Amino acid sequence: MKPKVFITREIPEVGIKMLEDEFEVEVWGDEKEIPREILLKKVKEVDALVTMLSERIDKEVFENAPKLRIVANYAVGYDNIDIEEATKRGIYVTNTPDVLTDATADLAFALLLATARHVVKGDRFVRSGEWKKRGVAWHPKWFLGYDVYGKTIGIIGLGRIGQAIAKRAKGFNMRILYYSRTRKEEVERELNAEFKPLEDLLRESDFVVLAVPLTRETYHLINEERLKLMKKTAILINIARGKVVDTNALVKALKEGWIAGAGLDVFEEEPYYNEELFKLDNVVLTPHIGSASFGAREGMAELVAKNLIAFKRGEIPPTLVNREVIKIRKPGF
Amino acid sequence: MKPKVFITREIPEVGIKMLEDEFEVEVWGDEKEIPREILLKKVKEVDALVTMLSERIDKEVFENAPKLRIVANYAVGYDNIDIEEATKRGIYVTNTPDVLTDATADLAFALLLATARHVVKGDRFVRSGEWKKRGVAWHPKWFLGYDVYGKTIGIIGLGRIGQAIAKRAKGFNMRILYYSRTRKEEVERELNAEFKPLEDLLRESDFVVLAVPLTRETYHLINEERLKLMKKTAILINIARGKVVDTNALVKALKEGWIAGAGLDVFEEEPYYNEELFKLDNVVLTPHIGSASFGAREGMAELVAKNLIAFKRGEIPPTLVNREVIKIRKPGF
Numbered sequence: 001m002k003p004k005v006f007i008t009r010e011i012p013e014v015g016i017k018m019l020e021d022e023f024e025v026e027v028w029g030d031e032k033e034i035p036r037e038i039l040l041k042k043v044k045e046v047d048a049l050v051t052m053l054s055e056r057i058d059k060e061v062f063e064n065a066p067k068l069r070i071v072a073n074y075a076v077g078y079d080n081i082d083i084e085e086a087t088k089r090g091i092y093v094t095n096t097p098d099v100l101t102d103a104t105a106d107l108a109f110a111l112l113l114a115t116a117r118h119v120v121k122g123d124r125f126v127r128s129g130e131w132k133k134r135g136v137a138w139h140p141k142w143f144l145g146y147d148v149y150g151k152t153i154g155i156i157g158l159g160r161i162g163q164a165i166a167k168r169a170k171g172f173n174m175r176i177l178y179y180s181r182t183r184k185e186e187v188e189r190e191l192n193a194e195f196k197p198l199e200d201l202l203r204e205s206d207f208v209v210l211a212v213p214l215t216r217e218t219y220h221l222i223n224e225e226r227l228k229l230m231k232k233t234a235i236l237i238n239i240a241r242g243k244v245v246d247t248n249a250l251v252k253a254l255k256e257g258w259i260a261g262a263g264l265d266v267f268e269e270e271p272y273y274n275e276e277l278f279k280l281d282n283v284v285l286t287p288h289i290g291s292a293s294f295g296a297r298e299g300m301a302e303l304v305a306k307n308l309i310a311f312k313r314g315e316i317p318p319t320l321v322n323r324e325v326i327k328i329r330k331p332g333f
Numbered sequence: 334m335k336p337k338v339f340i341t342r343e344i345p346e347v348g349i350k351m352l353e354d355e356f357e358v359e360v361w362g363d364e365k366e367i368p369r370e371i372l373l374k375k376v377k378e379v380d381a382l383v384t385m386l387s388e389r390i391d392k393e394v395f396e397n398a399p400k401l402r403i404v405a406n407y408a409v410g411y412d413n414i415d416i417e418e419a420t421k422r423g424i425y426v427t428n429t430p431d432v433l434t435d436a437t438a439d440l441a442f443a444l445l446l447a448t449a450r451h452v453v454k455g456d457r458f459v460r461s462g463e464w465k466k467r468g469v470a471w472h473p474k475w476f477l478g479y480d481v482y483g484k485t486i487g488i489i490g491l492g493r494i495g496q497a498i499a500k501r502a503k504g505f506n507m508r509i510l511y512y513s514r515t516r517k518e519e520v521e522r523e524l525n526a527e528f529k530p531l532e533d534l535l536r537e538s539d540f541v542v543l544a545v546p547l548t549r550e551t552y553h554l555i556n557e558e559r560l561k562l563m564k565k566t567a568i569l570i571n572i573a574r575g576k577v578v579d580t581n582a583l584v585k586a587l588k589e590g591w592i593a594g595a596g597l598d599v600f601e602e603e604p605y606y607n608e609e610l611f612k613l614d615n616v617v618l619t620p621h622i623g624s625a626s627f628g629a630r631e632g633m634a635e636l637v638a639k640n641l642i643a644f645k646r647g648e649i650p651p652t653l654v655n656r657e658v659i660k661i662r663k664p665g666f
């Protein structure tokens with residue numbers, strides 16, 4: 001167990017214990033994210049790294065990590081890693097797909113329902129004592145929300161999570177529409193999902209759900225132009241990446257009533273603060289807790305360890321993101 | 334259109350307009366529920382009544398309503414009406430089943446997911462600016478919640494809404510258990526639901542959902558004894574009636590960690606206020622908004638009108654609750 005690995009956050013002990021028997025492990029345990037200056041210091045002697053989205057693994061990090069051969073992201077997304085640069089350097093990059101699919105799909109529906117039915121607003125009304133203080137038991141128009149069952153859901157990005165969201169949508173007998181980079185006729189057949197050009201999906205959906213990774217092509221995909229295409233009664237749900245949505249445009253759309261509401265788990269900056277957005281009572285916000293379930297956190301921890309241990313043994317990591325690297329340099333330290 | 338009807342709340346205009354062409358309609362439009370003294374005054378000359386749960390239609394009301402022949406509840410529950418007394422007097426009682434089934438089942442799942450994943454707590458954390466102010470982007474243990482997909486759901490009361498909840502549970506690939514007064518083998522076959530004695534359902538469920546009406550038999554069904562039977566990681570969801578749950582016992586169970594959390598849409602008194610309950614961050618509360626969807630409210634309004642108009646025409650109301658009354662007195666004014 002001579003290989004050295006530095007883990008940038010206190011992930012589940014199950015994964016740390018698996019790594020301890022194969023690597024010399026070090027784990028960042030401060031309350032705040034590891035400072036850039038300290039990260040550059042820590043990567044100087046490591047053979048492997050386990051990172052969070054908060055760490056920008058760019059060329060500067062690689063230039064300061066001469067022994068680094070594998071970076072395991074404790075996340076399924078990898079927009080925080082310069083994949084092209086890594087591959088060029090023969091550095092393997094892994095992520096945690098599948099093990100967090102159901103937790104994120106569950107949260108996506110939690111936001112869809114909470115936003116559609118004003119659960120957060122209702123909770124505040126009761127909990128604050130306003131309900132009792134005002135002395136009125138019920139009104140027909142109070143917290144009047146949108147039906148979900150039988151309605152149309154438009155999923156943008158029909159990947160691992162997009163499909164999981166579609167499976168749940170069938171439990172609500174919804175009409176499923178989707179727009180994605182790759183068409184999946186088999187999924188279309190099995191779930192009765194129907195492919196639609198982005199423009200038509202936006203016009204026909206009662207609920208628009210974002211499940212695409214952040215790339216040059218998805219950056220601000222949902223802009224002012226597209227928000228205007230959506231139904232005024234439609235709700236936008238984002239569990240993908242904040243930068244996939246033009247926040248200023250979204251806030252404008254909500255204030256002007258172009259759409260009915262939005263449920264967001266991701267933002268353009270994290271932590272995030274936007275006074276105008278936070279004033280709106282037709283939005284539901286969560287701090288990137290998509291994979292925050294006991295099962296997901298554990299699976300992610302075990303998967304990160306599996307990838308590093310497989311690599312140490314000269315095997316191809318199970319969830320390698322840049323497979324071209326294999327031809328550049330064979331696995332191992 | 335000589336029959337007179339008094340409606341105790343401003344329900345959707347679609348229903349009021351349907352009634353206007355067949356009855357002389359009067360609609361209570363004050364901010365607060367109609368006072369008892371005024372209700373007794375108003376029922377003196379009416380032939381029909383459209384009531385909300387806030388109105389207790391007991392013997393005292395009947396004794397003061399000599400012309401009353403039909404009471405249409407704008408609700409599916411009717412624990413606010415003395416059905417036995419009504420029948421005896423030849424008074425027809427109708428409710429609004431089915432038209433609000435999907436809205437309530439949707440809200441039930443909204444609470445299940447919101448409670449399991451700490452959506453309300455997360456929203457407060459972001460919205461209050463605490464997330465940004467503290468400057469920490471993410472922690473592995475923050476808002477750590479329970480997986481829903483593939484977990485076990487125990488539905489108590491497998492009726493219209495209980496079954497709707499089970500259909501949604503299949504979208505989450507859940508193991509479905511149920512305890513109800515009547516066994517439905519066909520539903521067991523179609524949804525893979527499994528009947529279980531109440532005690533076994535409580536011990537085996539990860540999520541316990543209440544969907545039974547309030548009766549002498551369901552009053553405080555979930556008491557201290559039964560809360561102790563549930564898993565310490567289980568969550569209780571109540572969209573039925575508040576009195577089906579011993580609130581003091583529930584608060585004790587939550588404070589002591591007997592169960593993981595609870596999502597409640599109904600309370601023992603409405604409006605409700607309970608300082609100890611409202612302090613708990615593992616509960617989600619909504620003000621009886623189960624049927625608060627545009628579609629449900631409209632369907633309910635049309636159904637109430639359909640029942641009264643059918644009755645006027647000497648027909649049996651579509652959703653008559655006390656069918657024994659037909660033999661007591663034929664329909665009509």
Ligand SMILES: NC(=O)c1ccc[n+]([C@@H]2O[C@H](COP(=O)([O-])OP(=O)(O)OC[C@H]3O[C@@H](n4cnc5c(N)ncnc54)[C@H](OP(=O)(O)O)[C@@H]3O)[C@@H](O)[C@H]2O)c1
Binds near residue numbers: 217291
């Ligand atoms: N909020 C959270 O906590 C959380 C949790 C997990 C994931 N996420 C986010 O969700 C993203 C997706 O996760 P996942 O595992 O489903 O990823 P995945 O299976 O790759 O799915 C991504 C989907 O987006 C499609 N796509 C990519 N670029 C597109 C474009 N330009 N236009 C239309 N569709 C495009 C992909 O198409 P292809 O078939 O062509 O590749 C695929 O269908 C992650 O990258 C991450 O950003 C967030």
Ligand SMILES: NC(=O)c1ccc[n+]([C@@H]2O[C@H](COP(=O)([O-])OP(=O)(O)OC[C@H]3O[C@@H](n4cnc5c(N)ncnc54)[C@H](OP(=O)(O)O)[C@@H]3O)[C@@H](O)[C@H]2O)c1
Binds near residue numbers: 433
């Ligand atoms: N929160 C809201 O806004 C909202 C909205 C709608 C309804 N509700 C509440 O939900 C209740 C149920 O509505 P629904 O239309 O599903 O009613 P429903 O079809 O009668 O369903 C009630 C279910 O409870 C069962 N049940 C009755 N007594 C029982 C007992 N002692 N033990 C076990 N099971 C028992 C019934 O069995 P059987 O087959 O034997 O009759 C039936 O399966 C309503 O009465 C109301 O109180 C609340």
